[PDB]
Amino acid sequence: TGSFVEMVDNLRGKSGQGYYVEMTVGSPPQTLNILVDTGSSNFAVGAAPHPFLHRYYQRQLSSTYRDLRKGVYVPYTQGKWEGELGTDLVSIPHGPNVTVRANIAAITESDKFFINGSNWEGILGLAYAEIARPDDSLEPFFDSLVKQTHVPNLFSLQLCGAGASVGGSMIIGGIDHSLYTGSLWYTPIRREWYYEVIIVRVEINGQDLKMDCKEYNYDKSIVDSGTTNLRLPKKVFEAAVKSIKAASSTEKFPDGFWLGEQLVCWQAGTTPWNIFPVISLYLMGEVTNQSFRITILPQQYLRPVEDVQDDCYKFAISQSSTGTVMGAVIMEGFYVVFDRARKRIGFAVSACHVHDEFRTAAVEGPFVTLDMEDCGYN
Ligand SMILES: C[C@]1(c2cc(NC(=O)c3ncc(Cl)cc3Cl)ccc2F)N=C(N)CO[C@H]1C(F)(F)F
């Protein structure tokens, strides 16, 4: 670890929208805001006008553009885009001070992909080539950056979040000691596709959810800066909501609150954080039979929703059909180290996380936990 002073505070976002970093593409450099997504593996940028884009990548104005003469078509569950592959020179101005040639998906058509008012014009997929489109031979941006420079094979994310635009830091090539307090605890990257991890125990205010730990990782668990919610498999979600309801029973909320469909509001400044429980996930450690525990607050899983005398919030723990997703609701408590070189993900208490005078997010260990390999879904 050390000081990476140029990359501190290089992330921005609209509350409720994703975190982006400024990048440049082409010669002379064209500036774009790029969504930071550890849940995907393509670098793709708007490259034709769109009602939601106020600027885009103009290939004909870049002397260093090279046309791969191949298309790429990418449908998601919600939304889709189509693009033309090529390469160009790419920099991150508040970044590692190096310029690399990378594959770029130039997006020429799209539907429900760009978000009105989000202020980003492309997406930086930071996961591994296995899930790149159209196939794993399309080298992702971070793979190219490391191969072409001496940047260490690691990046770290501090997503700060709101209580006003949000901010944070993406440290490319290192770990900035000023962005966390306490110890960094590492969990193995189980497999290099998404950033897949293994959860071995779940507590609500210290009360064990008491499920077969395989349920926590069915069919996977990933760390995803491109998702807001903490998303839990159906059986785990139902158990967690029941327990969170009971711990907060001093106040009653309509069923639609717990489904994320309705806001809950309190008089400005009187949100009763202390009646809601903390949520702890225990992650497999690097040592045989050891785990560690990360703990978030209601300040993370109750999302502020602004509107021009009340503070109103949406519940941001929701049901998944594709395994656990540790999204911004998890990441905003922590400084998260994606240590690709050593195949591990580090968590430490974030120096910017939102909390109150009496409770803080936490990272603690070690805990004796047996048969942790049985928690992984084959
Ligand atoms: C590819 C994908 C994706 C994610 C986003 N994320 C956001 O906009 C966002 N990010 C962070 C926060 Cl805090 C809030 C928001 Cl609202 C946007 C476009 C996009 F294409 N990446 C994922 N990891 C999961 O969703 C995927 C899906 F395609 F299905 F949308």
Curated annotation (Swiss-Prot):
Glycosylation sites: 97, 116, 289
Gene Ontology terms, MF aspect: amyloid-beta binding; aspartic-type endopeptidase activity; beta-aspartyl-peptidase activity; endopeptidase activity; enzyme binding; peptidase activity; protein serine/threonine kinase binding
Primary enzyme class: hydrolase
Induction behaviour: Up-regulated by the Ca(2+)-regulated transcription factor NFATC4.
Principal subcellular localization: membrane
Subcellular location as annotated: Cell membrane; Golgi apparatus, trans-Golgi network; Endoplasmic reticulum; Endosome
Effect of residue 37 to N: Decreases beta-cleaved soluble APP production
tRNA-binding listed as a keyword: no
Record-level GO cellular component terms: axon; cell surface; dendrite; early endosome; endoplasmic reticulum lumen; endosome; endosome membrane; Golgi apparatus
Residue ranges annotated as Extracellular topological domain: 1-378
GO terms of biological process kind: amyloid fibril formation; amyloid precursor protein catabolic process; amyloid-beta formation; amyloid-beta metabolic process; cellular response to amyloid-beta; cellular response to copper ion; cellular response to manganese ion; detection of mechanical stimulus involved in sensory perception of pain
Tissue distribution of the protein: Expressed at high levels in the brain and pancreas. In the brain, expression is highest in the substantia nigra, locus coruleus and medulla oblongata.
Disulfide bonds: 160-352, 213-375, 265-312
Membrane-related topology note: Single-pass type I membrane protein
Keyword set, alphabetical order: Acetylation, Aspartyl protease, Cell membrane, Cell projection, Cytoplasmic vesicle, Disulfide bond, Endoplasmic reticulum, Endosome, Glycoprotein, Golgi apparatus, Hydrolase, Isopeptide bond, Lipoprotein, Lysosome, Membrane, Palmitate, Phosphoprotein, Protease, Signal, Transmembrane, Transmembrane helix, Ubl conjugation, Zymogen
Active site residues per record: 37, 224
Post-translational modification: N-Glycosylated. Addition of a bisecting N-acetylglucosamine by MGAT3 blocks lysosomal targeting, further degradation and is required for maintaining stability under stress conditions. Acetylated in the endoplasmic reticulum at Lys-70, Lys-210, Lys-214, Lys-220, Lys-234, Lys-235 and Lys-242. Acetylation by NAT8 and NAT8B is transient and deacetylation probably occurs in the Golgi. Acetylation regulates the maturation, the transport to the plasma membrane, the stability and the expression of the protein.
All copies of domain Peptidase A1, residue ranges: 19-348
The EC number(s) this enzyme carries: 3.4.23.46
Protein purpose: Responsible for the proteolytic processing of the amyloid precursor protein (APP). Cleaves at the N-terminus of the A-beta peptide sequence, between residues 671 and 672 of APP, leads to the generation and extracellular release of beta-cleaved soluble APP, and a corresponding cell-associated C-terminal fragment which is later released by gamma-secretase. Cleaves CHL1.
UniProt comment concerning the protein's domains: DXXLL motif is required for a proper endocytosis and retrograde transport to the trans-Golgi network, as well as for regulation of lysosomal degradation. The transmembrane domain is necessary for its activity. It determines its late Golgi localization and access to its substrate, APP.
Record family assignment: Belongs to the peptidase A1 family.
Designated name of the protein: Beta-secretase 1
Gene that encodes it: BACE1
Portion of the parent chain present: 57 to 446 of 501
